[PDB]
Amino acid sequence: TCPFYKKIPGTGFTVDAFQYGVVEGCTAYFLTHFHSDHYAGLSKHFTFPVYCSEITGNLLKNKLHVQEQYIHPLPLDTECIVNGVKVVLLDANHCPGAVMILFYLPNGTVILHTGDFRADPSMERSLLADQKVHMLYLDTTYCSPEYTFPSQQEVIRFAINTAFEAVTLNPHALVVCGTYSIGKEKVFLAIADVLGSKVGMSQEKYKTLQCLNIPEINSLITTDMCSSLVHLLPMMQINFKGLQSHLKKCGGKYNQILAFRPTGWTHSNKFTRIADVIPQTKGNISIYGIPYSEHSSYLEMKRFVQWLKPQKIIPTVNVGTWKSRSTMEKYFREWKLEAGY
């Protein structure tokens, strides 16, 4: 049964709640972004409206095969009426096509649902700057002060450096990048750009990328593996046995892989900086982990909430145990007492 933090009061609206069957009274099912925990349940056989971004729509039509009529894409940053309720979609700074949703209730209540987000100061000069938000449904993935990690522009620096080094030292080395969902495209696009290459990938991953409205995408990517020296691979595959396997397939065209596993937080963030990173090494294969996050750090989250001064906060992540719920409330109370709301 749909949990209360997936419903919007005073509406027929639900958010990311596609895995319960029909939801009694739900006229509309919102989807914040194309990640399988949030979309779990959608298919070709859905015959209720789905509101989402244009990009999320393309993924719905082409990857899940939902029928065009039931996909209502909406522009971002545009005041839109939906069953006689004003709503706005705002960029979530998560993956491609990921949005937050502003709901303007008839009664005067304003609600913000963040979806998955990486909070940023540019969100403080958006349409949110113009009015008061009473309820906040918040991505709490990293709501604990241990969770620090670098900026995305810092990570893209390291990456561009490491790869452009090794390839200039050894011009017969391959760059590999791990992946298992949309997100983090900047990692491989930036490396390929510094190397003068296209990124090569499976057909299914090519298909996914062709849905994302990336400008000039036809010049950046290929299904011809042979022609490319930045390859993508399933994240499951990014290990020694699997990289050996893959290094066989390229047929004596490269003599060294240099891989990147973009990850979120891991416990080695607590002790080691990004400039002082190293890889595991079993022969000529070298696997880097790099903490490129598309979720708010604790400090980023804290700042966004303290600016927003919401009257109430409803977590959407780590809500499954009383211990986590309890820890989170304590942080929300501190933030409130510091900031005076």
Tell me which H or E stretch contains 221. strand 221-222
147 versus 254: smaller Cβ distance to Ni ion: 147
Q: How far is the CB of 156 from Ni ion (least distance, A)?
A: 20
Q: Toward Ni ion, which CB reaches closer, 184 or 261?
A: 184
CA distance 295 to 297: 7
- In terms of CB distance, is 116 or 185 closer to Ni ion? 116
CA distance to 229, 246, 284, per residue, from 254 (Å)? 9, 11, 10
Amino acid sitting at position 64: L
Shortest-Cβ-distance residue relative to Ni ion: 116
- Return the SS3 of 173: strand
Minimum Å gap between C-beta 94 and Ni ion is 6
Give CA–CA dist 160/65, Å, rounded: 36
The residues binding Ni ion (CB under 5 A) are 35, 116
Identity of the amino acid at 79: E
Least CB distance to Ni ion at residue 35 (A) = 4
Distance in Å, CB of 10 to Ni ion, minimum: 27
For the record, the structure tokens of 19 come out as 């895995």
Shortest CB 87 distance to Ni ion, Å? 20
Strands 71-74 and 50-53, how do they pair? Answer: parallel
The conformation of residue 7, written as its DSSP 8-state character, comes to: B
Nearer to Ni ion, 261 or 295 (CB): 295
Nearer to Ni ion, 48 or 180 (CB): 180
d(CA 94, CA 100): 10
